[PDB]
Structure formats: structure tokens, C-alpha cells
Design a protein around this ligand. Structure first.
Ligand SMILES: *P(=O)(O)OCC(C)(C)[C@@H](O)C(=O)NCCC(=O)NCCSC(=O)CCCCCCCCCCC
Ligand SMILES: *P(=O)(O)OCC(C)(C)[C@@H](O)C(=O)NCCC(=O)NCCSC(=O)CCCCCCCCCCC
Lengths: 75, 364, 76, 77, 316, 69
């Protein structure tokens, strides 16, 4: 129900339009990103809404489904 | 430099006193530097700092230093007090008493206790904002554990008979907690002359830093609380202690000045804008918090949402209590801020009384 | 115990207080110093006078630190 | 005495703390300098140089923390 | 938070963070702190720590150097050489020496901002005591041949002073390769605090407050660590500003000899208009904290004002 | 001269009609040491000129303040 907002933020930070917004996609393998862009991505997700993500949970966010199932799993 | 009227922010009324920040600088420096540049004395310097802060807070409220516990603010202090006493005494004390004009956090905690199985009665307030002592004294049950009445109302600015409430609670072996967040350092408080058992203290309300508070828990006799389902940083604790000491030395001067400026604001507003009423009993009013209701301003005064639930408890009509203004005057408030605020208030009330809100209301 | 040094302390505290980068702190400082010296006027106990002078010197140090550091953070 | 995830955590901490600068030039300079620094020092193999860069990064993180918080206590709107 | 067009320097947070503990302890001194600051200033300019003296600014450094050497040789060396485009303090000190009986020659600068080495080498007298030439022209943004001037002065046994206030931390300086004998340094030029400066006094055979000294040393250390990055960044931003102005105004020229430009100072001359409040020329400045938004806003406002002022003057 | 007497009248609470060029501060104007220090500081605030303590001590009459530089 809030996966579209996550995909919107990922699309905004990584510079991808609303057509390549595929669910279950790796950041480094399917979106052309690296560890630094990933850190800035997690910081963007925790930056849009006032919610915090620890380092252990942020390191596990290497795909899209990891980010979709971590902002809902910690409400 | 552009001024700001005395009704925009409630935090703007209590800025950080430069003496407090000056007390906090060395601990900020030794704090926000990662624990590899700290010296082999940080532990002692922090135990000593927190002990001095305890002595300052305690000395302001007439308590013993061992009775001061540092929290993250008056909210955590409230939860510790009500939920601590209630959850610790779930054996033979399952009843709690409070007022309908308390802060939102206290009411929320009492609703949480009600959801977990505690019986709570919310005492109504009279049209003066003061509770009826006969209603409180007649509402104590054999299983009543805690009575929580704030010392000053943050919306109307009226003082509750804290000493008498403490006398009534101690006369029936009932614990007495008070939310003194809007009262500490501004009006005199003695935890011994007033039969107070638990007290909540906010740092940024007394010109201290944000994110720090305190709670007084009596030890003679010993009052106990249950831990809630963490450690506040040292520079903020130092700041709370410094703010309490400065407040103790400046309370009389600040009260005289704030009374003068408050009377200036109210007299200048009533002199030019008729049909204005002041909420709260003037004979038991603290001057720092003013709350004025204006008559013929239909709709809402925007500067969809809910009205004021404190003004509804003092028997004020929906439309009258809907558009109301809470002015704040503090230690650093200047006369120019007061005159600019009364001018802006006159302009806005005069403008809004000749208009109707239907235009902005229909914007879809 | 110093006659001219008390006036020099008043002058120094006013001059340093006028350099506050903030309006509320500057106005409060000048007002509180003025009202403070005016209120403690005609005090005879030399111990109380010495105490007031000591507090005035410490507060002068506070005003100095806060004015200088605040000025170092005061972006204009 | 550092790993990869600890370096990424250091990057996250320095970006998070740098974004809390009350001034525009300091915030932009900090974020820009950290981004360019990690991107430039990417793919370094000599462990001595990596350890040196990490230590300097921790020192600079302490500077950013102190300056952000103290400046925030002085930042009058 | 709005912007401000590109026409001191801001206080680098590392510097303020370095001087905070000393500021705290200063109201209500450290030999170690002042020794570390001395080592930092010396390490930036390639000197030994024992050769660094802290002053209240580059003004006091200039007066100490020029007036010190001149007043020491008031016996048989009453002639000094400097530039007519020096800072106001240097010119004022030379005018004071002229009032005391010293003959001073103010060498002119060419249209490129660089001094004529043939004119300088031909202006040395047998009774010349000191040659004072600024390191960079702060108005046109051109570098002076400091190393060559130092070689000429050391070959002729005459002391060489330089005002590096606008050059330290912005261009590389080695006090030995350039054969410098005296140098002036200003703190608030290199993102350090105001009210502190330094002077290099050569010692080899070829009461300023402590928080301010600490601040100067910290500014020098940060400058030493950031000189390359700041040079690339400021060079990019300068080329962006100049190129973006040239793309829209096909008649603006940049004053100063290229290939001898330090990137921080740009000087552009406009044809039929002058005096732009926000022939004569306009000097844009770009520093460590200058953002691309400030550059683009400055180019936009500059194009708008030039176009308007050209559309308000009857010409063709 | 208008700024000196105007500032003295403004700080000491005197209108532009009781602005006498020859009145003692402590005996004819109802002032004290504090009002004197604040007055001299106000004079240093009107025009960008500073007055040392020694020259300020000699300012016991109105004519001393009227054009001293
Ligand atoms: P990612 O690609 O999946 O993983 C990260 C990589 C692999 C790139 C990285 O962790 C790595 O291991 N690379 C090898 C080189 C390396 O580890 N370098 C260490 C980087 S530390 C560094 O260079 C930081 C420099 C300090 C920045 C200071 C900024 C100061 C700002 C002050 C503001 C006032
Ligand atoms: P003049 O007539 O020559 O002098 C006036 C008199 C004689 C009254 C005075 O100079 C004097 O000698 N009186 C003796 C008693 C006296 O007043 N002693 C000086 C006491 S000083 C004092 O009261 C300290 C007050 C300082 C308070 C500072 C508060 C502001 C802090 C701001 C923090 C941000």
C-alpha cells in the first residue's frame, strides 16, 4: 500500500523514470548503482518520512523488495 | 531585524539562556567528539556534572538531590509518574484521578492505563479553570493510587491549588503527581510545603536546552515506580541544572517584569478591541500565558482541524472558543514585541470581524 | 572595596552586552545590568558589595564568551 | 581494524551529520566533499592508506558533530 | 535562504572547531597550542617553525617587515622598491617611510598585471635595502614571478619581502625555492579568524590571543590539505562563470595574462556600461564554499544588468 | 550640537524645550553615575567616535559634551 511511494523515491534518487520501476530489482545489478548510491538511497528513504533504519537493516537493503519489506516491517 | 508577534510559537517564549549554553559548552565539546578523543576523566566529569545538576534542580524545587531523575522531557516524566505508580501498584491501588484540562501526554497516558485495565476519572474544571476541591476530595476511592494535576495550565495559564490538592491526597494516603513543566522556575514550588510525591520538569520550558527533562520522586516516604517497556546526554543535563539555578536566582525579577508586560498587553488589547474576554481566573493566573477569546469572529482565525478541548472544559461556546489566541511572554520578551503583538492582533481581529470564511473554506 | 572599578565594571558589562548578535539577548542584557546596578544601589554591607562585584565579573565573562562565540556562529 | 560495512556506516554517519548543518554553504560543502572524497578514494588497495583515510574520516566526523550541534544551539532564525 | 552574487572568507568549521576549547578558556594561553600553530603555518609555506611570528594580521606583518628592514638600514640604505598596486597598508607604510626620509620607487604593472622583471632588475640601487612585491594581484587575479624576483634579489644581496595574504593556501608556496626572506600572511584570507596574521622571517643561510593563533594554524593546515581539491573545484567554477558569460555577451574580455591566473579571482571588463550595483572592470570572487547556484545566479544577474544598462544608453 | 543635546534630552527624558546648555548633571538634572555612563555611551553611539575614561571623567558639565573633538 506504500510500495509505490518507495519506488517513487528510488526513481527520484537513482534517476530512473516511471517506466523502469520494476518490483524485485537489485540496486547494483538491475538499476546501475553502487554502495554509495545505496547508502544515499537508504538515507533518502529514512529522510522522506521521520523513520530511522539501523546499520544492520540498511546493509541488508540491496534489492527493491528489501526496501519494500523493511519500511513496513518496522512501523 | 524583524520582530515576531507573541503568539506564533510556544517555544519562542523560552529561548536558550546564554548563561545555560555557556554552562553547556565544555560538555558539548567533550560529548559530540567520538569516544576516542575523550580523556581518561570523562566518566568522573560526567558523574560530577550530573550530581551538580541534581543539586540545582532539587534546590529549585526544595527537594533532596537523590530525589531527582533525569529524563528526555516532561513527557517521559509524565509516563514514568502515572504509568510507574499505576503499574507498580496494580495490587491494591487500581484507581487514578486527573483533570480534563491536563496536557495531551498526561491524558494519553491515562487513556493507555484505561486500555490496560485501570479505572480513571477525569475531574471537570470550573469556568475559572480551577478544579473543585470538593469534587476532588469526594472522588477519592479506597483503591485510588495517584492524583495528577498540573501546576500551571499551558493553554489558559491558570494555577491549580497544588498545596491543597497535596493536603487532600496525603490526608487519604494517595500519591500526588504534578506536571510543573510550565511552572518550574516561574512560580515558587516547594515539594515539602506542597504534599507533592512526583513532579514533572521540562528543560526547554525553563530556558534550558531541548530534549532534557526531570522527575521528582519522593523518598521520605519512598514512592516507587515500574520501569517502562536511554541515558540522556550529559550536556543537556548540565543545561537543565544551569537553567534551574538561573531560574532560582531570577524568578522574582522575571515575575515582576512578566506581570508588567502582561498587564500592558491585555490592557492595550482590551482598550482598542471591545468584546474581548480573558479565559482563566485572573485571581489565580500566571502572567506568562495569556489566552484571549474574541466575540464576533465567525468561522476560524487561520494563521478543518479540531478546536480547543481545554476551553471546552471551562464552559466556553464552540464559536467563541474556536478562534482564540494564546499570547506568551517570557524572560527575554521586549516591550516592542508586546506593542507589535497588540497592533497585529488589533489589525487581524478588525479585519476578520468584517469578513466571512466561506471563500477560503470552499477551495476544492 | 573599589569605587572606580565598580563603575568600570558597569561600563564594561554594558559595552560587551551591546555586542550581542541577537536582539532578545542584547536587550535583556542591557536591561538586566541597568536594573541590577540600580537595584543594588545604596548597599552598605561590604561583603554583599564584594559578592555582587564577583557575580558581576563572572557574568561579564559569560557575556564575553557568548558574544564572541555567538558572533563566530552569527552568519550575516 | 575496519571492514567494508563499517566504512559504509561511516559514510552514512558523515552524510547524515553533514545534512544537519544550519548553514547552506557548510552543508553543501560538507556533502559535496564527502561524496567526492569517497568516490575519489574508491578502489584503493594499500591498507595503510585506507586506514589513514578512515581515521581522518572519523576525526572529521567528530568535527561535523560538534559544529553541527553547537552551531544549531547558536543558529538564531 | 537566498543567494548573494560573487561581488573576506567564511570561517571553516574545522578551524572554529579547532579554536573552540581555547575560546572557552580565554574568557573568565598555551605555549603548546602556539607551537603547534607555528608548525602548521611553517609546514604550509615550506619553512621551519622557528621562522614564524604571529601578528594581528597581514597589516602588522607588512609594517614589521618593511619598516623593520628600512628603519634598520636608515644609515646607508634609504631606498626601497615596491609596486604601486600593493595593498593600502603597504602603500601607507611606504608613504610613512617617504615622510621619514626614505626614497621609495613604486614600480608600475603592465596591462597583464605582472611586474616587468627587466624594470625591477634595472631599478636596484647600490643603497637599496628591501624589495617588497606582492605574491598575487588581488584585483586582476594574476600571479607575480615571485621565484624569479627572489632569484634576482638573492643574486644581488638584497632582502625580499612579499605580501602573500591573497596567495597563501590558494597557490603553492615554497619559501626556499622562491628565495623569499620575509612574507606576510593574513588569517581571514584563508578561512581563518579575523584579527590574526603571521610573518615569515628567514633564518637559514640560503601578544595576539591564543584562540586566534590556533585558528590561523588550523586554517593553514586545512588549506594545505585542501589546496589541490580547492584548486580543481575553483578552476572548474571559474571556467563555468567565464564561459557562461562569454556565451551570452560576445564582447566581454578578461583582464590579465592567461597561464598566470590564480582561479579565485576573475576580472571581466564590460564595453559600454559600468557601475553594476546588486574603462572599468568587475572582479568576481570564487572560494572554497562557493556553490554552482551562486555562480549561475551571478551570471544571470550579470547578464540581465548588462543587457538592461546597454538598452538604456543610446548607441549602436 | 543638535545631536549632543538631542541625545541627552532623549536618554535623560527631557523634551526639546528644557534643553539648557548649562545645567549640572547631578544637581540640576537629577542623574546618577549609571545615567552618566549610559549617557556617555549614548554620545559614543550617536557619532562613530570613542571617548576614553579619563576624558569622560572630565565631562561634568554640558559644555564639555558640546563639541569636544
Ligand atoms: P561499494 O562500492 O559497494 O563499497 C564501498 C567501497 C568498496 C568503494 C569501499 O568501502 C572500499 O572498500 N574501497 C576501497 C578503498 C577504501 O576502502 N577507502 C576508504 C574510504 S575513506 C575516505 O576516503 C574518506 C575520506 C574522508 C572524507 C573527509 C570529508 C571532510 C569534510 C569536512 C566538512 C567540514
Ligand atoms: P556614583 O554615585 O558615583 O555611583 C553610584 C553608587 C555610589 C550607588 C555606586 O557606584 C556604589 O558605589 N554603591 C555601592 C554599592 C553597590 O552598588 N555596589 C556595586 C554592586 S554591583 C552589582 O550589583 C552586580 C550586579 C550584576 C548583575 C548582572 C546581571 C546581568 C547578567 C546578564 C547575563 C546575560
Amino acid at each position: 500500500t506504500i510500495e509505490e511511494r518507495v519506488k517513487k523515491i528510488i526513481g527520484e534518487q537513482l534517476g530512473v523514470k516511471q517506466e523502469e520501476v520494476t518490483n524485485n530489482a537489485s540496486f547494483v545489478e538491475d538499476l546501475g548503482a553502487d554502495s554509495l548510491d545505496t547508502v544515499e538511497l537508504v538515507m533518502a528513504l529514512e529522510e522522506e518520512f521521520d523513520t530511522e533504519i539501523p546499520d544492520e537493516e540498511a546493509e541488508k537493503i540491496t534489492t527493491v523488495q528489501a526496501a519494500i519489506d523493511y519500511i513496513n516491517g518496522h512501523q | 531585524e524583524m520582530l515576531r508577534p507573541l503568539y506564533m510559537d510556544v517555544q519562542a517564549t523560552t529561548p536558550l539562556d546564554p548563561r545555560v549554553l555557556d554552562a553547556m559548552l565544555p560538555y558539548l565539546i567533550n560529548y559530540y567528539g567520538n569516544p576516542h578523543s575523550r580523556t581518561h576523566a570523562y566518566g568522573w566529569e560526567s558523574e560530577a556534572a550530573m550530581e551538580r545538576a541534581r543539586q540545582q534542580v532539587a534546590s529549585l524545587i526544595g527537594a533532596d538531590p537523590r530525589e531527582i531523575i533525569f529524563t528526555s522531557g516532561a513527557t517521559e516524566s509524565n509516563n514514568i509518574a502515572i504509568k510507574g505508580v499505576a503499574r507498580f501498584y496494580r495490587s491494591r491501588k487500581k484507581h487514578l484521578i486527573t483533570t480534563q484540562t491536563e496536557h495531551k501526554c498526561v491524558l494519553d497516558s491515562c487513556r493507555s492505563l484505561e486500555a490496560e485495565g485501570f479505572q480513571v476519572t477525569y475531574l471537570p474544571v470550573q469556568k475559572s479553570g480551577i478544579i473543585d476541591l470538593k469534587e476532588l476530595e469526594a472522588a477519592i476511592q479506597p483503591d485510588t493510587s495517584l492524583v495528577s494535576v498540573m501546576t500551571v495550565n499551558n493553554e489558559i495559564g491558570v494555577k491549580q491549588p497544588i498545596a491543597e490538592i497535596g493536603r487532600i491526597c496525603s490526608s487519604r494516603k494517595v500519591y500526588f503527581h504534578t506536571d510543573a513543566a510550565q511552572a518550574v522556575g516561574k512560580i515558587p514550588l516547594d515539594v515539602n510545603d506542597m504534599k507533592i510525591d512526583l513532579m514533572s520538569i521540562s528543560g526547554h520550558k525553563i530556558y534550558g536546552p531541548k530534549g532534557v527533562g526531570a522527575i521528582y520522586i519522593r523518598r521520605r516516604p519512598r514512592v516507587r515506580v515500574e520501569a517502562l517497556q536511554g541515558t540522556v546526554p550529559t550536556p543537556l543535563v548540565v543545561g537543565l541544572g544551569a537553567a534551574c539555578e538561573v531560574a532560582q536566582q531570577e524568578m522574582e525579577y522575571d515575575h515582576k517584569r512578566i506581570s508588567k508586560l502582561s498587564e500592558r498587553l491585555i490592557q492595550n488589547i482590551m482598550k482598542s478591541l471591545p468584546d474581548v474576554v480573558m479565559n482563566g481566573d485572573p485571581k489565580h493566573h500566571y502572567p506568562g500565558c495569556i489566552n484571549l477569546s474574541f466575540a464576533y469572529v465567525e468561522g476560524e482565525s487561520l494563521l478543518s482541524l479540531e478546536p480547543s478541548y481545554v476551553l471546552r472544559a471551562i464552559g466556553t461556546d464552540e464559536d467563541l472558543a474556536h478562534s482564540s489566541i494564546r499570547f506568551g511572554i517570557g524572560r527575554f520578551t521586549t516591550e516592542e514585541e508586546v506593542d507589535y503583538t497588540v497592533e497585529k492582533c488589533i489589525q487581524h481581529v478588525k479585519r476578520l470581524r468584517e469578513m466571512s470564511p466561506l471563500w477560503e473554506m470552499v477551495q476544492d | 572595596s573599589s569605587r572606580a572599578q565598580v563603575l568600570a565594571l558597569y561600563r564594561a558589562m554594558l559595552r560587551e552586552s551591546k555586542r550581542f548578535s541577537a536582539y532578545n539577548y542584547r536587550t535583556y542584557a542591557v536591561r538586566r545590568i541597568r536594573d541590577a546596578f540600580r537595584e543594588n544601589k545604596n548597599v552598605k554591607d561590604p561583603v554583599e558589595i564584594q559578592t555582587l562585584v564577583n557575580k558581576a565579573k563572572r557574568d561579564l565573562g559569560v557575556i564575553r564568551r557568548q558574544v564572541h562565540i555567538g558572533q563566530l556562529y552569527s552568519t550575516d
